């Protein structure tokens, strides 16, 4: 995260670091618990991860360095990806970790609401950033949990900040046209939660940006409303 600050513990408790053990463990990624054996994520993440017996799930961290050999995780049953997914600046960046166990709620570690389909009209002001990356392009995976306000950007905005792309209503923007706070490497994954009518809800996974909180380049999410119904398809399976 560039131009944030540290969380409080127990701020985003759905917020998880997502380590691969492959060749050593580190943090790969950003995750949000939305189901109690449920991950919602970013497809690209599994770039390379031929199997999900390489991950490890961690829930109610603040700091980095409350993970050692000891420290509990909830191992991944299965990586479900989007079927339409070729890559991050393509859109369909989003992908399920089915996880072996269950995840016992509290408020330490609890689930965020999928955005309503009926919300798909209302306008969020009030939307956070979250992970461990980096500061800046060339830095390291932060100790402690970072957070960052940033506004919405229309799609009409993103697109014409971002020439070359095709910026689709399955992605959602968010920056300042100054730049200076957005996500950056190893936030992938990750949350963009929005606060409405006292609620958190999961409005987007931080997907990709050209370089991080660069003045007029805001953050590209997957836009979690338009993948609700695949959710629902992949976690209320019969
Ligand atoms: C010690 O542990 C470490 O150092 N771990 C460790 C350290 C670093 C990484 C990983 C692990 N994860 C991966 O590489 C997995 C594969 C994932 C690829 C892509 C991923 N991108 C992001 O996280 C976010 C991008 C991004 C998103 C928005 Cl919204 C805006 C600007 C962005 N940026 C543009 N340029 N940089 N950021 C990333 N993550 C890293 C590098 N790149």
Redesign the pocket.
Known sequence: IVGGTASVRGEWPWQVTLHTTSPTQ????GGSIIGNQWILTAA??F?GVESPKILRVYSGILNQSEIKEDTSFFGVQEIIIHDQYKM?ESGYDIALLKLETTVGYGDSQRPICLPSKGDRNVIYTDCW?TGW??RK?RD??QNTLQKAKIPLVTNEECQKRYRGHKITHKMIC?GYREGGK????????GPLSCKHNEVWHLVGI???????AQRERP???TNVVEYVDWILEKTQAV
């Not at 580190?26 to 990624?29: E, G, K, M, S, T």
């Not at 957005?182 to 992938?188: P, W």
């Not at 931080?206 to 991080?212: F, M, V």
């Open positions: 580190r943090h790969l990624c690209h993440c770039y991050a950033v990356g980096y392009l390291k995976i968010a957005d996500a950056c490497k190893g936030d992938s994954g931080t997907s990709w940006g050209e370089g991080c953050g590209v999410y």
